[PDB]
Amino acid sequence: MPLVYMNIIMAFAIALAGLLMYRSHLMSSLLCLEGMMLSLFIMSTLIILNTHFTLANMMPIILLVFAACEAALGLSLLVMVSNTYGTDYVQNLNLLQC
Amino acid sequence: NVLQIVRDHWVHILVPVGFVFGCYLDRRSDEKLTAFRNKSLLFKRELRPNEEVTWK
Amino acid sequence: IARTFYDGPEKNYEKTMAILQIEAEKAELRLKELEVRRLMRARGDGPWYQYPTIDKALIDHSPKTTPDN
Amino acid sequence: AKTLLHKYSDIPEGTECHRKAYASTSIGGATGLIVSAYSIALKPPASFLEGVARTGRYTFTSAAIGAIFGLTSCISAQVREKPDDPLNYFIGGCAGGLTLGARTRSYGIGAAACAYMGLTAALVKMGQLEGWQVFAEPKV
Amino acid sequence: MNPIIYTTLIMTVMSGTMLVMISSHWLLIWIGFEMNLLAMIPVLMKNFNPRATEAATKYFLTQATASMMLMMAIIINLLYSGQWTITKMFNPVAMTMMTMALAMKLGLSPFHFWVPEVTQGISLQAGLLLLTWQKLAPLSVLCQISQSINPNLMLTMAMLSILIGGWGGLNQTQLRKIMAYSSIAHMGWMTAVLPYNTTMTILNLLIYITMTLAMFMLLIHSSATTTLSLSHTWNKMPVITSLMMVTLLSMGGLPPLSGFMPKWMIIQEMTKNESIIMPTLMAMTALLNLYFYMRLAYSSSLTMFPSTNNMKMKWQFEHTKQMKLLPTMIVLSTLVLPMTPALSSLN
Amino acid sequence: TMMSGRPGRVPLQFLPNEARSLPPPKLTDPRLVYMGFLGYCSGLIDNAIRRRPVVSAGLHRQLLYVTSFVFFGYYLLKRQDYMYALRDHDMFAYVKSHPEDFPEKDKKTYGEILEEFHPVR
Amino acid sequence: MLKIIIPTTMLLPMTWMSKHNMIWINATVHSLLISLISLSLLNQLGENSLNFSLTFFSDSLSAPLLVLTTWLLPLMLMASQSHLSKETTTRKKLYITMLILLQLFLIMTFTATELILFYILFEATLVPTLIIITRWGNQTERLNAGLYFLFYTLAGSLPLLVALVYIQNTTGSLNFLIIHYWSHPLSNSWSNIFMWLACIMAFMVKMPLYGLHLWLPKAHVEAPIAGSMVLAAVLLKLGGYGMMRITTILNPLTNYMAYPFLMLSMWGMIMTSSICLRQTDLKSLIAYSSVSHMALVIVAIMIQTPWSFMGATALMIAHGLTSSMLFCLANTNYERVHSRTMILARGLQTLLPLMATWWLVASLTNLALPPSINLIGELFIITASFSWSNITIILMGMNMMITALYSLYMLITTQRGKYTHHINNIKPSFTRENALMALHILPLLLLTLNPKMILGPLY
Amino acid sequence: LLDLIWLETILPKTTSFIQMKMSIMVSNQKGLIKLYFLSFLITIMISMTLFNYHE
Amino acid sequence: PFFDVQKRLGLDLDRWMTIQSAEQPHKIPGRCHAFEKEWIECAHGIGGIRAEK
Ligand SMILES: CCCCCCCCCCCCCCCCCC(=O)OC[C@H](COP(=O)([O-])OCC(O)COP(=O)([O-])OC[C@@H](COC(=O)CCCCCCCCCCCCCCCCC)OC(=O)CCCCCCCCCCCCCCCCC)OC(=O)CCCCCCCCCCCCCCCCC
Ligand SMILES: CCCCCCCCCCCCCCCCCC(=O)OC[C@H](COP(=O)([O-])OCC(O)COP(=O)([O-])OC[C@@H](COC(=O)CCCCCCCCCCCCCCCCC)OC(=O)CCCCCCCCCCCCCCCCC)OC(=O)CCCCCCCCCCCCCCCCC
Ligand SMILES: CCCCCCCCCCCCCCCCCC(=O)OC[C@H](COP(=O)([O-])OCC(O)COP(=O)([O-])OC[C@@H](COC(=O)CCCCCCCCCCCCCCCCC)OC(=O)CCCCCCCCCCCCCCCCC)OC(=O)CCCCCCCCCCCCCCCCC
Ligand SMILES: CCCCCCCCCCCCCCCCC[C@@H](O)O[C@H](CO[C@H](O)CCCCCCCCCCCCCCC)COP(=O)(O)OCC[N+](C)(C)C
Ligand SMILES: CCCCCCCCCCCCCCCCC[C@@H](O)O[C@H](CO[C@H](O)CCCCCCCCCCCCCCC)COP(=O)(O)OCC[N+](C)(C)C
Ligand SMILES: CCCCCCCC/C=C\CCCCCCCC(=O)O[C@H](COC(=O)CCCCCCC/C=C/CCCCCCCC)COP(=O)(O)OCCN
């Protein structure tokens, strides 16, 4: 496994760890999700380019599409959270504790 | 007089009918286990000239 | 009482013989089925536990713009 | 990982009680560390120092329990000249249970813990002897 | 929300699940999961309130993280073998990632935390959908790749799920959280038999879905979301509470009710392998689920709780809309054990 | 797992052609009668839930319930019987084609076998 | 044997379609007819069983139990129809449905020819009993009684299911006949030790064994009278039936695995028998006496000799009848004074003479007066135990003396002395109650006339 | 001493106490996704290190 | 779990992209086309259990 592959997988692991840790803002978590999408796109593109899988070249593109969908979804939700509290702090999302 | 008392006490035939049905079902069930009828080493006997089964 | 309500001993005797035969056959069949299943799962040579493999009808056998495929 | 269990198991049952005690306390420390990690993750301690205090407390309790269990079980097996017998394991487990009672400073916990741990330890020994599998490999 | 839009969203959720079910390509299964989640997010938010927004956000975050791990596992498998087909999954690291992603999607322990809160935060209709239909696609994927299931990891998660569901249900007063914890325990029972026989998994899934549908339709008929609000139902619908008690006993796993059939079979299957200790532990742990089912039955059917004066007015009105398939689901949820051998039509 | 991949299997058939070479379940099969009983119970529960006279509210819908349950049960029984027949066929063929794995052992009488005796006292 | 099973399933719709004021009459009449029909199973062979079909069979051990069940249902109806007078017709039909379902499950249980079906029905018996106790009990302790009963049963019964499926996979069958003919010895192994424990502990709990008996006083005291009757008479004997059916595969491990339980059964015999000496509640006294008698039966099964088995069968039948009668007698006083305290209503022989003689006859039967079948069973078990070990006679004789002591103590406390002065609502005994007592007690003496019918297959 | 205290204490009372304690421990969560996802990260690391290493 | 609708209907919804050796546009071959075709031909029809060894 080349060293660039290792760097891309390390980037994905870093983004996943960054998402699984929450500081205060939901936007930062959405950014970590987008970073995971970006690392997955780069990994898939490198694998498909190295092994000349011609018909697989549309696969990353489709990936990107659904990335946007997730992003869109998250952004929509964030708006609602803000409209309820005035901030996007994840600590306010504690109603379902009881 | 028959109609009203029948509509009142038709429930008293459910259990006798159930017992009759159970007897019939037991007969049907034990008519399926005849693979050794008149074939046992202890009860193998010659059939009579008029009968056809040792037991029903 | 014996004539009206009951039967002879031969009927129960032979019914018991038939029942015993059926249950013994079932027991031997269950043990055989367990052994067959173990062998088929271990080896994969039987009709059972045949996990799918890629269909060879999908391969394209045509010149590929490069002689060495 | 499971290599700790290997370092524990590769030592014969009634020999080298010091090495067996070391392996047992390693296993106990690992378990206590995992428990501390989950406890900190789910119940924050409101300060870093209190978190390290809770981690150290849990890890020390687990390590002491493991060390006492391993030492007592090995010593019993070696002295009694009867390995491959679950009484040694039961004795070690009860001793380990007693340690928990002393750590938490409670006679009920100690007494309750000792019986349960001893029973559990004996069952594990019987499973090792007979060949019971907790996670059976799919065979049929 | 418009009825046409609601129909379209439900159809999109179902089409995503079907796409996961009928696909042989990993990318198409991923796309089915994405479409399912995308259409599911608004359905949880049909009745707008801060609690619904909370539940939708938590569900979205969990499922998005699971989707990331799913895609990463797929890509690693592609890297180590240029295969897109859903098969044996030649790489073990990718296999562990896939198992964890699907477990997080299902709600198996220790990824269970979101299920009680999401269930409590949404309505009973959305809860029914979440706890019945959303379990099909991950279980289908898990069934297809059971040959590479690491028995240690899956069995650990299943036993953890059973233990956690049993313990968590004991502390609950709200009905939706009770249903969520019962769902977690049943998921553990379902996935425990997965490495050995997927037919048993499908049988347990069908029985669980029938019982859950019966329970949710009963809870919708009697508009109760708490224990004390369900304590009032005997004074208006005694028949509903009696049927609910029998259904609860069936979910508790008592014979000769339908809920006994799956676990029974599952136990037998693991006993065909060696696997003796685990089924024993699972039975003694399902005792906890039976306990809190019986507590609910005591509150709702076997005792008469105090009522209120206004209830008299409710005595004068019938139900405007009646849920079809409720009688059939009750019957299938209780009196079906004698037809146990018919499970042979599942493989 | 065990039967999902079997050679010559149509995916969504539910009833292969070879299944017609098996005896159909009788219309008085007790499992079919139990399915009809389940349909009757569903009809009665439907009557009770909608607050209608349980025994005699809707006879047409109760008949539809019973006939629907019997109808589904007939094909369910056919498929179950076919799958069990397939299991037996495959097991017998596998036994026949692997003789060294299923050898017929020597027959011994109880006069030759020595069983240990455990007195009760 | 469907000629008995189908008439009960017909008792169901007949009850549900009878008019409001004739449910009790129809149920009683047809239950009595069904018991008369079931009486035909007592014609047992001398060598093998009565193998009716592939699923049902009967031998000389299950036939008396079936007759006891079918006979007990009408008594339960007659005793129940008093305290349910103010109940609505629907819930009365529901109660009768619970009783009918219980009897049907018991009838199939006692004759199931394979172990998994026997287990399924043995556990199915739990649901009607639990519903009866927790829905029609009187005090607020009925909920806890139901919980204790259910969980005590299931905790011991689930490992039995695991062991049963294990045995079926290893041997290939669970049919009692194939199991008996193909039986093999159990080796002295830890795996075999735990298999023995799993096979035995469910029936131990159902007896109940001393130490696992804490559910029985709660359940039998908090239950309505029909629930108490079915619990004491029949549901306690499921453990004995299962024990004497499953011990055929546990040899020769039993020879040394019975050592703890025997002790728990012997010393426990004393302990529970002593508790009755200081009971301030009549129902609890009867329940603890049931515990001691069942301990004697456990000893009989564990020592595993033909005389012990005959004594165990006789004692099971005799205790069923006697305990049912005692519970009904106590319930009459309870409906009089609405209190279970023994010393509340005293000197009842002055006011209820015929009920006093019923009390005397029940107490005499309880303390094993010869030549009752109670004494026959107890004496056969005692002789078997003496053959087992000559030191057992000390414990058995201690138990006999304590049993006589508490039986006559209860009789003297309730019936003799002087009446309580302020209690003035003691009406004359009804025809229903006296008929119930007579129908309990006449079969006991008629059975000591011909005891071979309750002595089991070893006869 | 025996029937009302110790036989009660050993089997049902100890069982009820332990089950109630474990229920309180498991159920009582703060409701915050921060701690939940921290637990998810811990679980993922444990699974990767423990099960995956022993292929 | 898997409802093989494509095989039932002969549809080819996503099978064209599953492998490297299946009809790429302009007949562009994969880097490992020969090895993949050899493996698939060797493993065809014998099942996963046998084909692994
Ligand atoms: C491909 C698959 C793999 C994917 C995953 C791959 C992962 C690797 C890549 C990672 C790349 C990292 C880059 C960025 C990450 C983003 C971090 C972030 O966003 O921060 C948000 C997060 C939230 O911050 P905030 O909300 O803005 O500020 C409010 C306060 O933080 C809180 O407010 P407060 O002050 O009121 O609270 C009190 C105080 C309380 O603080 C404490 O209580 C913590 C003190 C615990 C003591 C630690 C044990 C000490 C002794 C252990 C010795 C080891 C063995 C020695 C021998 C035996 C010893 C007896 O604070 C806390 O509550 C913090 C608790 C969480 C601690 C860190 C969580 C990490 C996992 C849990 C570890 C639990 C440790 C227990 C033992 C575990 C086993 C060793 O920040 C933190 O959690 C604080 C620390 C963050 C900095 C360190 C980040 C590095 C961790 C990365 C993964 C761990 C190692 C991985 C290595 C793998 C091998 C290659
Ligand atoms: C099935 C049929 C029926 C059976 C069911 C019923 C029977 C079974 C259940 C009943 C018995 C089990 C009870 C379990 C222990 C209860 C303790 C508890 O719950 O803690 C909470 C409870 C209160 O919680 P706390 O707030 O933390 O304590 C505050 C105290 O009030 C403040 O206390 P303090 O400040 O005044 O003084 C504290 C200190 C000072 O101690 C004292 O205050 C007084 C001394 C008490 C213990 C020392 C023994 C002295 C008398 C024994 C002499 C020989 C006896 C005959 C034995 C040989 C036979 C020939 O205590 C100690 O340090 C005692 C250390 C333990 C040494 C004893 C070791 C005996 C092992 C057994 C050997 C024989 C086995 C039989 C073999 C037979 C073969 C034929 O703790 C206590 O109060 C009791 C602690 C004393 C322990 C007594 C244990 C001895 C009884 C034998 C147990 C064996 C049965 C189970 C076997 C497995 C167990 C490991
Ligand atoms: C194994 C062998 C066979 C057994 C199989 C299993 C049992 C049978 C099947 C079960 C399902 C069948 C029907 C279910 C729906 C019925 C619900 C109902 O309420 O019925 C009312 C209805 C009477 O009400 P109505 O006349 O409309 O007017 C009064 C008002 O409705 C007054 O209405 P209300 O609002 O005042 O009622 C309030 C009451 C209403 O509450 C209830 O009625 C309880 C509903 C039962 C729950 C059923 C759930 C599903 C079934 C599961 C069964 C499990 C069995 C396994 C063992 C475990 C036991 C739990 O609730 C309460 O008062 C609270 C009481 C709390 C007690 C808790 C126990 C409840 C669960 C008991 C389940 C046991 C099975 C009962 C079967 C019979 C029940 C009718 O009952 C019937 O008339 C139906 C009886 C059966 C009809 C058969 C007649 C056919 C023709 C006869 C001749 C036969 C062939 C002739 C040819 C021969 C040649 C001549
Ligand atoms: C409590 C009861 C719950 C039952 C749930 C609802 C009951 C009604 C079921 C509706 C029947 C219609 C479904 C399918 C009919 C036609 C479609 C046909 O082609 O399906 C084929 C065969 O049909 C279904 O597979 C079988 C459905 C039969 C369901 C009944 C069994 C219930 C379990 C036993 C409990 C007893 C219940 C008694 C009746 C109530 C699929 O073949 P295949 O492509 O190869 O399967 C792929 C997935 N596999 C291999 C992993 C299974
Ligand atoms: C409230 C009442 C409930 C009912 C109680 C039921 C009691 C069940 C107990 C069953 C007794 C037998 C179990 C063990 C069999 C042997 C006894 C023990 O002493 O084993 C000795 C061995 O020495 C040690 O004792 C080994 C066991 C050590 C661990 C057991 C101690 C458990 C403590 C008691 C717990 C209380 C029971 C309740 C648990 C909840 C025998 O030496 P050995 O001849 O070589 O082995 C014979 C067996 N082999 C051949 C299969 C190997
Ligand atoms: C009211 C409370 C009553 C409580 C009763 C519950 C306990 C009953 C006794 C324990 C039952 C568990 C037995 C498990 C099922 C038996 C099946 C069996 O015996 O098979 C053995 C398997 O044996 C086991 O694995 C048994 C493991 C036991 C684990 C469960 C622990 C439960 C508690 C143990 C201690 C308590 C037992 C007595 C308590 C009495 C109640 C006070 C052989 O399997 P193989 O792996 O193939 O071995 C041969 C080839 N090498």
Residues whose CB is less than 8 angstroms from the CB of residue F19 and which lie 6 or more positions away in sequence, other chains included: F78, F79, F82
G311 closest CA partner among G378, G242, G411, G225? G378
Dist CA H23 CA G55 (whole Å): 44
Q: What are the extents of the domains in chain A?
A: 3-92
Dist CA I51 CA I42 (whole Å): 8
Helix D86-104 with D107-130: angle, nearest 10 deg? 150
Question: Do residues E232 and E307 lie in contact, with contact meaning Cβ atoms separated by under 8 Å?
Answer: yes
Most I CBs within 10 A among A46, A47, A50, A54, hence the mutation to make, goes to A54
* Helix runs in E123-237, H state only: 124-132, 136-144, 151-169, 175-192, 198-221, 227-230
Within 13 Å and on the Cβ side, how many CA atoms surround C46? 25
Dist CA A18 CA A28 (whole Å): 9
Dist CA C4 CA C1 (whole Å): 5
Where residue G185 falls (left for φ over 0; alpha for ψ -120 to 50; beta otherwise) is beta
Which among H35, H50, H53 is the nearest to D41, CB-wise?
A: H35
Structure tokens at G242: 């299962």
Residues whose CB is less than 8 angstroms from the CB of residue I16 and which lie 6 or more positions away in sequence, other chains included: A55, I22, I23
Contact check, Cβ <8 Å, B23/G3: yes
Residue in D closest to G191 by C-alpha: D130
Which DSSP string corresponds to D93-120? HHHHHHHHHHHHT-HHHHHHHHHHHHHH
Dist CA G225 CA E302 (whole Å): 18
Q: Is E87 on the interface with C (CB under 8 A)?
A: yes
* G114 strand-pairing partners: G175
Dist CA I53 CA I43 (whole Å): 10
Residue with tokens 């990463």: E72
Contact check, Cβ <8 Å, F98/C39: yes
User: What is the identity of the amino acid at F64?
Assistant: L
Q: Tell me what percent of chain G is helix, strand and coil, each rounded to the nearest 5.
A: 75, 0, 25
From the CB of A31, is ligand 1 less than 6 Å away?
Answer: no
- C-alpha angle H27-H32-H34 in degrees, rounded to nearest 5: 120
Structure tokens at D52: 């390290």
Question: Do residues E210 and E186 lie in contact, with contact meaning Cβ atoms separated by under 8 Å?
Answer: no
Residues whose CB is less than 8 angstroms from the CB of residue D78 and which lie 6 or more positions away in sequence, other chains included: D14, D15, D17
G133 closest CA partner among F45, E333, E172, E297? E297
- Residues on G contacting C at a C-beta cutoff of 8 Å: 40, 43, 45, 48-51, 53-54, 168-169, 171-173, 175, 177-178, 181-182
CA distances from D3 to D23, D66, E124, G179, G250 (A): 10, 16, 48, 46, 41
From the CB of G195, is ligand 6 less than 6 Å away?
Answer: yes
* G175 strand-pairing partners: G114
G434 closest CA partner among G33, G76, G79? G79
Structure tokens at E244: 């609910």
Structure tokens at G327: 């519970």
Resolution for the entry shown, Å: 2.8
Phi and psi angles of residue A50, each rounded to the nearest 5 degrees, phi first: -70, -50
Question: Do residues G441 and G361 lie in contact, with contact meaning Cβ atoms separated by under 8 Å?
Answer: yes
CA dihedral E209, E214, E220, E224 (to 10 degrees): -100
Q: Which residues does ligand 3 sit against, CB inside 6 Å?
A: B 14, 17; E 238-239, 242-243, 246, 256, 301, 334-335; F 41, 44-45, 48, 53-55; G 9, 13, 16-17, 90-91, 94, 97, 101, 127-128, 131, 135
D87 alpha carbon, distance to own chain's centre:
16
Dist CA A26 CA E56 (whole Å): 14
Question: What length does chain D have?
Answer: 140
Contact check, Cβ <8 Å, E82/I1: no
Which DSSP string corresponds to E219-238? HHHTT--BHHHHTTGGGT-H
Considering only CB atoms, which chain A residues are within 8 Å of I32? Answer: 51
Most F CBs within 10 A among E326, E344, E346, hence the mutation to make, goes to E344
From the CB of F12, is ligand 4 less than 6 Å away?
Answer: yes
Q: For residue G204, give the ligand 5 atom closest to its CA.
A: 4
Q: Is G17 on the interface with F (CB under 8 A)?
A: yes
Question: Do residues D41 and H42 lie in contact, with contact meaning Cβ atoms separated by under 8 Å?
Answer: yes
Nearest CA-CA distance, residue I42 and chain A, Å: 21
Dist CA G150 CA G130 (whole Å): 7
Secondary structure (3-state) at F54: coil
* Helix runs in A1-98, H state only: 3-20, 26-50, 58-85
* F102 strand-pairing partners: none
Which DSSP string corresponds to H1-55? -IIIIIHHIIIIIHHHHHHHHHHHHHH-----HHHHHHHHHHHHHHHHHHTTT--
Question: Do residues E263 and E207 lie in contact, with contact meaning Cβ atoms separated by under 8 Å?
Answer: no
Reduce the secondary structure of chain G to three states and give it as a string.
CHHHHHHHHHHHHHHHHCCCCCHHHHHHHHHHHHHHHHHHHHCCCCCCCECCCCCECECCCHHHHHHHHHHHHHHHHHHHCCCCCCCCHHHHHHHHHHHHHHHHHHHHHHHECEHHHHHHHHHHCHHHHHHHHHHHCCCCCHHHHHHHHHHHHHHHHHHHHHHHHHHHHHHCCCEHHHHHHCCCCCCCCHHHHHHHHHHHHHHHHHCCCCCCCCHHHHHHHHCCHHHHHHHHHHHCHHHHHHHHHHHHHCCCCHHHHHHHHHHHHHHHHHHHHHHHHHCCEHHHHHHHHHHHHHHHHHHHHHHCCHHHHHHHHHHHHHHHHHHHHHHHHHHHHHHHHCCCECCCCCCHHHHCHHHHHHHHHHHHHHCCCCCCHHHHHHHHHHHHHHHHCCCHHHHHHHHHHHHHHHHHHHHHHHHCCCCCCCCCCCCCCCHHHHHHHHHHHHHHHHHHHCHHHHCCCCC
Phi and psi angles of residue G19, each rounded to the nearest 5 degrees, phi first: -75, 170
* G112 strand-pairing partners: G56
This structure was determined by: cryo-EM
H33 closest CA partner among E184, A29, A69? A29
G246 alpha carbon, distance to own chain's centre:
19
Residue with tokens 């110790």: H6
CA distances from G65 to G41, G100, G239 (A): 10, 16, 12
Q: Using only C-alpha atoms, what is the Rg of chain H? A: 19
DSSP G278: G
Dist CA G124 CA G117 (whole Å): 10
Considering only CB atoms, which chain F residues are within 8 Å of E318? Answer: 51
G70 closest CA partner among G24, G25, G26, G108? G108
E125 closest CA partner among E57, E45, E62, E34? E45
Gaps in chain I (C to N over 2.5 angstroms) fall after: none
DSSP E107: T
Exposure string (b/e) for E159-168, b if CB count within 10 Å is 16 or more?
bbbbbbbbbb
G215 alpha carbon, distance to own chain's centre:
15
Question: Do residues G277 and G210 lie in contact, with contact meaning Cβ atoms separated by under 8 Å?
Answer: no
Nearest ligand to the C-alpha atom of residue I4: 4
Ligand 6 centroid, distance to D79 Cα (angstroms)? 30
Helix D17-42 with D48-80: angle, nearest 10 deg? 150
Ligand 5 centroid, distance to H14 Cα (angstroms)? 22
Number of continuous H segments (helices) and E segments (strands) in chain F: 2, 0
Dist CA G430 CA D75 (whole Å): 75
Dist CA G320 CA G444 (whole Å): 10
User: What is the identity of the amino acid at I23?
Assistant: E
Structure tokens at E347: 């493989």
Instruction: Reply yes or no: is the peptide bond before residue G208 cis, omega within 30 of 0.
Output: yes
Contact check, Cβ <8 Å, A74/E60: yes
CA dihedral A17, A23, A29, A31 (to 10 degrees): -90
Dist CA D113 CA D104 (whole Å): 11
Residue with tokens 């019936």: G415
Question: What length does chain F have?
Answer: 121
B22 closest CA partner among G116, C23, G43, G34? G34
Which among B8, B14, B33 is the nearest to G14, CB-wise?
A: B14
Ligand 6 centroid, distance to H12 Cα (angstroms)? 20
Secondary structure (3-state) at G440: helix
Dist CA F81 CA F19 (whole Å): 9
Kindly state the helix (H) or strand (E) to which residue B22 belongs, with its residue range: helix B14-30
Residue in F closest to G389 by C-alpha: F121
Question: Do residues H53 and D1 lie in contact, with contact meaning Cβ atoms separated by under 8 Å?
Answer: yes
G322 closest CA partner among G301, G294, G350? G294
D124 closest CA partner among D70, D61, D52? D70
Question: Do residues G265 and G299 lie in contact, with contact meaning Cβ atoms separated by under 8 Å?
Answer: yes
Ligand 3 centroid, distance to F41 Cα (angstroms)? 9
Dist CA G396 CA E20 (whole Å): 71
G216 closest CA partner among G199, G244, G186, G239? G239
Name the residue of D80, D81, D119, D120 to mutate for ligand 5: max ligand atoms within 8 A of Cβ. Answer: D119
User: What is the identity of the amino acid at G127?
Assistant: V
Phi and psi angles of residue F56, each rounded to the nearest 5 degrees, phi first: -130, 40
DSSP G235: I
Considering only CB atoms, which chain A residues are within 8 Å of H29? Answer: 97
Structure tokens at E327: 């009688």
Exposure string (b/e) for A29-52, b if CB count within 10 Å is 16 or more?
bbbbbbbbbbbbbbbbbbbbeebb
DSSP I29: P
Nearest CA-CA distance, residue I36 and chain C, Å: 9
Instruction: Reply yes or no: is the peptide bond before residue G252 cis, omega within 30 of 0.
Output: yes
Considering only CB atoms, which chain C residues are within 8 Å of B33? Answer: 14-15, 18-19
Secondary structure (3-state) at E114: helix
CA dihedral E100, E102, E108, E112 (to 10 degrees): 90
Q: What is the CATH number of domain A3-92?
A: 1.10.287.3510
Residue nearest to atom 56 of ligand 1 (CA): D33
* G341 strand-pairing partners: G281
* G281 strand-pairing partners: G341
D7 alpha carbon, distance to own chain's centre:
14
Q: Tell me what percent of chain I is helix, strand and coil, each rounded to the nearest 5.
A: 50, 0, 50
Question: What length does chain G have?
Answer: 459
Q: Is F102 on the interface with C (CB under 8 A)?
A: yes
E21 alpha carbon, distance to own chain's centre:
18
